[PDB]
Ligand binder design. Structure first.
Ligand SMILES: [Cl-]
Ligand SMILES: [Cl-]
Ligand SMILES: [K+]
Ligand SMILES: [Mg+2]
Ligand SMILES: [Mg+2]
Ligand SMILES: [Mg+2]
Ligand SMILES: [Mg+2]
Ligand SMILES: [Mg+2]
Ligand SMILES: [Mg+2]
Ligand SMILES: [Mg+2]
Ligand SMILES: [Mg+2]
Ligand SMILES: [Mg+2]
Ligand SMILES: [Mg+2]
Ligand SMILES: [Mg+2]
Ligand SMILES: [Mg+2]
Ligand SMILES: [Mg+2]
Ligand SMILES: [Mg+2]
Ligand SMILES: [Mg+2]
Ligand SMILES: [Mg+2]
Ligand SMILES: [Mg+2]
Ligand SMILES: [Mg+2]
Ligand SMILES: [Mg+2]
Ligand SMILES: [Mg+2]
Ligand SMILES: [Mg+2]
Ligand SMILES: [Mg+2]
Ligand SMILES: [Mg+2]
Ligand SMILES: [Mg+2]
Ligand SMILES: [Mg+2]
Ligand SMILES: [Mg+2]
Ligand SMILES: [Mg+2]
Ligand SMILES: [Mg+2]
Ligand SMILES: [Mg+2]
Ligand SMILES: [Mg+2]
Ligand SMILES: [Mg+2]
Ligand SMILES: [Mg+2]
Ligand code: NA
Ligand code: NA
Ligand code: NA
Ligand code: NA
Ligand code: NA
Ligand code: NA
Ligand code: NA
Ligand code: NA
Ligand code: NA
Ligand code: NA
Ligand code: NA
Ligand code: NA
Ligand code: NA
Ligand code: NA
Ligand code: NA
Ligand code: NA
Ligand code: NA
Ligand code: NA
Ligand code: NA
Ligand code: NA
Lengths: 337, 53, 132
RNA sequence: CGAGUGGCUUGCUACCUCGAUGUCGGUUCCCUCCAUCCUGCCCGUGCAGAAGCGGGCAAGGGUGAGGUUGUUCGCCUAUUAAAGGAGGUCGUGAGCUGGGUUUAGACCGUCGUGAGACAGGUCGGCUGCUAUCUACUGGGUGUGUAGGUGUCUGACAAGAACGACCGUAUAGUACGAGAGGAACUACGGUUGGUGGCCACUGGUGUACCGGUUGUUCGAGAGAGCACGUGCCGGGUAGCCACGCCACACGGGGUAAGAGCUGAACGCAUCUAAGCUCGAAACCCACUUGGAAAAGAGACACCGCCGAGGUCCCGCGUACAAGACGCGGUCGAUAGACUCGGGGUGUGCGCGUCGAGGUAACGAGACGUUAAGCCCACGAGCACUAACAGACCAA
RNA sequence: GGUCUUAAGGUAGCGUAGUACCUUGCCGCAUCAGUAGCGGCUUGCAUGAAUGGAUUAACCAGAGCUUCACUGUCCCAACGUUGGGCCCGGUGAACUGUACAUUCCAGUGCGGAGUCUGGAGACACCCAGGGGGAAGCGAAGACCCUAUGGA
RNA sequence: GCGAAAGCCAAGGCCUGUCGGGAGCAACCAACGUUAGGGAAUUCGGCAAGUUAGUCCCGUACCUUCGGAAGAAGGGAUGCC
RNA sequence: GUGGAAGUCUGUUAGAGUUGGUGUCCUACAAUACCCUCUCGUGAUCUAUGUGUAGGGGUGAAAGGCCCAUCGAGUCCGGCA
């Protein structure tokens, strides 16, 4: 009688096309609770390995026992805030007002930017505080970028620039906290924001797979029984009904797959170390060797090895953060074998 | 743990625990070892095997 | 039901013939259903370790042959995962007939039983020889 | 008995197509309706409890698997929260299928003088086309906004991004003579859906290594062919799923409903004015898209003889063209070499052993030898190759 | 009914049949479940003796059913090989074409509209795709009736 | 080797079953390989694919027109020196 | 034991046939083709060459089958505008 069945694939990650920036861009931000702070970082994906742990969860009957967890290694060398951007409130949303920069620029920030030569860090500041007096000062975000140079395994040097948000106690407080972070040289690190045990959201541009059929792109079925030896093996029965005399978009078709942005929710941070504690024997295949500032992530992460992935304190966490979990054994055993 | 076929130390968070018809337990560190036993070979004769070394 | 404390990958389907692990007078059992499981269009009903199934007695004593009885999966050939990541596969697939309260219809159990089975069906477990 | 609504069925009508709008059933894939089977919130009860019975709001999501039958229908099983119904040319044959209806062959029964018939039954019996327009999925080139780099904003658009169940405690408690037997709330898990990933298990892996049958290069050594590997054993990377990770709560406004204050109507009344609450549904939240939003945006910096871009060169975290991304001696972008890490599994040769044989000869065994061989990865290393240079630009 | 039509009035068999409308007949075997199959029963709508009946070993690209074995038929798909496919050089057709044509939702009309009416939406050009629509293309419908047609 | 069978190789013939170059070479298709656990749930129907296999020894049911059924089935062996 | 009968078996010997795939093709390589699958294969066998039967006539182990891509009455021209 036509047994029911949910559709094939989600209409929520559309239109399934190539992404505009190989660098992820957050749409939402964490609310302003605790003290003033930057709400995000970044680093380059290195690879996969397991870390043995002590069951943390106080509601796990197994609480306190051994437990092997999968971990995606990621290199998170210190990023640099090069400016403070301030948006104002208009009846047409939020618009940038101005930017306050520094002078100390990374030896290679010119590979991407037309690095400033003569800026006014006082008058812009001035204009900012004035907007605040008036009551039209919308949130404050810093223009940040990385040091791809800091990761040998990463071939690129040309910095991936991107804007993260600062939200603290009052607005005044984080305006200053912002100013100061910048004034110096903008240098900051993972520890400054995150802490092992905590929950974060990892956004990234998925592994790209070129054009693909609907079977692999929408999870439709290949032809079955006798049908499959007929001249159609991996294509749907129809594009639609007679009327409406047209093909909908809701119908699964051939197209671009992968290299789309996804902000994968609630990722746990196992540990944030430095050095080669994580690195594998032989070397992280198609990636290289890790040694330096990093972060261990529970589960999978968007994108292949070498891709930039951004962090943000989970905005919709389900569990309370069970800080600094005990790390009993991080496997270094080769990935080939 | 140690492999009940080859004898090489087994990497924690890796492996299969085969359970026989009688009840006996045999931990293998790899698929290579499993299939090398499914043929009829004894770890002693295989040179690359630590049991044999 | 209560957590198995292990990850299973179903090794059975509705229609699968398996071994009857007890002195009930049943030798061959045929899977028929899976308690608390509803599939999806076309997907043939999957049965794995520690699942209360519904069975048809395939082979055995002329009194037990063709009887619709409940039972519990105690062994299977597909690898099932434990907390520490190790995998665990058995020699064959099997289950012991059970009644309403979930107490074994037979007296003794033949062959081993995964330790995870104990946590869901103790009455079956407390009657076990080897618990791997 | 009386009034009606819908257009699934059936019938009537003969307007539409006979220079053809491909049948029934099924399949697949897509949007929808509500007259709601489950799930959410309610009401009544012949509502103690549990379990039901009848009604109301409600279309978010679900609504599965099999046995006989071409069947639709329907009959039967076991599961299930429940396994609701209907529309889209009785949705879908320039998609499949062709079991039935309905060609030609043949048999049976019935009828017939007969040719032959049947709204009887049965066996066999074909599925054409290189898409012009439109439509949608993805991908590029231009123009407009009127120099470039980077970062943004968000008109609007898409989502089911989540649905449901079992279990533990609450509890053998409330209630009940008893039997039996709840809930709020807190936890843990499974299932369906969804998005991503490959440490792990599994698949592949006609890269790779080994065993071996036939035959040919005299033997040996080393190789070719045996369908795109002879067969067999093992299998890296990668791609994968049978593997692994992640997928709320809460607000705001309401429906059915429960109420408040309250008059018309001194009283009473949830409604008329007003106010409090209240659905899995609606709005936000959250994910994805999105300056071509013609009101064609905002910021910062560089530049208008020069900022920046194209071709070029070495390559990919990208890839059907096009596009995207990185590097280019101020260098590790690629190759070579060497290590590292891996796959095989002990090389030729020679020494010894070797059932035997007058001898020739001798399959094989051991040692040499974790050997020989091999790598789609990593590192070291400028040795080679990233050189020369051309073009556009306010 | 305990003979009348029309000469006789179904004997052996066979039987729910490739014949049985009723029909998925009833009972059993078998299955979790069997409009199937087989056996029995059988008043056979409307079986039956050379219009041959029954029975039957052997044979069969003949028709229906069951079990063991086997497997990607399916659960539920993956990865691979070879030829295409895609980009370049060369060669180079056909189908089809009233016109206009970037449409979509409704409506309306000879009652199934890209072209009417009202709205909505739409910058142009191009590549690739699987075919929703043009009641797509192909064939002056084989189906039906009509003709003081044909064979 | 049973063989005018396979398969590999002569003698002889041919590179004219007559367009080419490039991309780890995407989707899609055509021939095909392998697929864990399950094993006809697929389907009108096991359609398609697969399974078995050559020779020798042991052994062989019902039924039968005494010819057959039968290679029934079932069981073991197979190399090289 | 000998003997070696047979519209006998196996069988891509050669040759003959055409079961399923409803595959490939379906402006083809082809106005009936390719591939795998399958049937016979000492006889009512297959085949070449020659030769006989002619249109309401042949020929037909009968399908209204065949008689030069033409058959429930061939083809050509004529009757015919
Ligand atoms: Cl199909
Ligand atoms: Cl079931
Ligand atoms: K018509
Ligand atoms: Mg690996
Ligand atoms: Mg390993
Ligand atoms: Mg189905
Ligand atoms: Mg008419
Ligand atoms: Mg049409
Ligand atoms: Mg209603
Ligand atoms: Mg009650
Ligand atoms: Mg809906
Ligand atoms: Mg239809
Ligand atoms: Mg429909
Ligand atoms: Mg169509
Ligand atoms: Mg058609
Ligand atoms: Mg038919
Ligand atoms: Mg038929
Ligand atoms: Mg038929
Ligand atoms: Mg076609
Ligand atoms: Mg070869
Ligand atoms: Mg019968
Ligand atoms: Mg007679
Ligand atoms: Mg108009
Ligand atoms: Mg006509
Ligand atoms: Mg007629
Ligand atoms: Mg006539
Ligand atoms: Mg399999
Ligand atoms: Mg079936
Ligand atoms: Mg077949
Ligand atoms: Mg013969
Ligand atoms: Mg077909
Ligand atoms: Mg002749
Ligand atoms: Mg006839
Ligand atoms: Mg002629
Ligand atoms: Mg002819
Ligand atoms: Na085909
Ligand atoms: Na085809
Ligand atoms: Na009607
Ligand atoms: Na017409
Ligand atoms: Na149909
Ligand atoms: Na609903
Ligand atoms: Na049915
Ligand atoms: Na129609
Ligand atoms: Na068709
Ligand atoms: Na059809
Ligand atoms: Na609410
Ligand atoms: Na613009
Ligand atoms: Na008669
Ligand atoms: Na296959
Ligand atoms: Na179309
Ligand atoms: Na040539
Ligand atoms: Na004799
Ligand atoms: Na053939
Ligand atoms: Na004539
Ligand atoms: Na004439």
């Amino acid at each position: 009688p036509q047994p029911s069945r949910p559709r094939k694939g989600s209409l929520g990650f559309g239109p399934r096309k190539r992404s505009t920036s190989e660098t992820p861009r957050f749409n939402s931000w964490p609310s302003d609770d605790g003290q003033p702070g930057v709400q995000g970082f970044a680093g380059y994906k290195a690879g996969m390995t397991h870390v043995v742990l002590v069951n943390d969860e106080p509601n796990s009957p197994r609480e306190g026992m051994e437990e092997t967890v999968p971990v995606t290694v990621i290199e998170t060398p210190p990023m640099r805030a090069v400016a403070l951007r301030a948006y104002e409130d208009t009846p047409y949303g939020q618009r940038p007002l101005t930017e306050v920069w520094t002078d100390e620029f990374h030896s290679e920030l010119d590979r991407t930017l037309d690095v400033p030569e003569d800026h006014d860090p006082d008058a812009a500041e001035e204009q900012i505080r004035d907007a605040h007096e008036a009551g039209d000062l919308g949130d404050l975000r810093l223009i940040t970028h990385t040091v791809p140079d800091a990761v040998p395994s990463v071939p690129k040097k040309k910095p991936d620039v991107m804007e993260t948000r600062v939200g603290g106690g009052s607005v005044s407080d984080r305006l200053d906290h912002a100013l100061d972070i910048v004034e110096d040289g903008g240098e900051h690190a993972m520890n400054d924001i995150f802490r092992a045990g905590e929950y974060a959201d990892v956004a990234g541009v998925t592994k790209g797979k070129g054009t693909q059929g609907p079977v692999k792109r929408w999870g439709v079925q290949k032809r079955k029984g006798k049908h499959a030896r007929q001249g159609w093996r991996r294509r749907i029965g129809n594009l639609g009904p007679w009327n409406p005399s047209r093909v909908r978009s809701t119908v699964p078709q051939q197209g671009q797959t992968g290299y789309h942005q996804r902000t994968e929710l609630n990722k746990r941070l196992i540990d944030i170390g430095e050095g080669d504690e994580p690195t594998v024997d032989g070397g992280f295949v198609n990636y290289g060797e890790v040694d330096g500032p990093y972060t261990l992530v529970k589960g999978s992460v968007p994108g292949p090895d070498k891709r930039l992935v951004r962090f943000r304190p989970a905005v919709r966490p389900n569990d309370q953060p069970r800080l600094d979990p005990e790390v009993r054994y991080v496997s270094n055993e080769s990935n080939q074998g | 743990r140690e492999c009940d076929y080859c004898g090489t130390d087994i990497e924690p968070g890796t492996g299969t625990m085969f359970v026989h018809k009688d009840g006996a337990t045999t931990h293998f560190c790899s698929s290579k070892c499993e299939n090398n036993a499914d043929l009829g070979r004894e770890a002693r004769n295989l040179e690359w095997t630590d049991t044999a070394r | 039901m209560e957590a198995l404390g292990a990850d299973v990958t179903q090794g059975l389907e509705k229609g699968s013939l398996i071994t009857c692990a007890d002195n009930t007078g049943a030798r061959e059992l045929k899977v028929i259903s899976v308690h608390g499981y509803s599939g999806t269009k076309n997907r043939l009903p999957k049965a794995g370790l520690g699942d209360k199934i519904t069975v048809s007695v395939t082979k055995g004593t002329p009194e037990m042959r063709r009887q619709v009885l409940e039972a519990v999966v105690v062994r299977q050939r597909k690898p099932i995962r434990r907390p520490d990541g190790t995998r665990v596969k058995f020699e064959d697939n099997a289950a012991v007939i059970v009644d309403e309260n979930e107490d074994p219809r037979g007296t003794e159990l033949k062959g081993p039983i995964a330790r995870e089975v104990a946590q869901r069906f103790g009455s079956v477990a407390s009657a076990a020889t080897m618990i791997v």
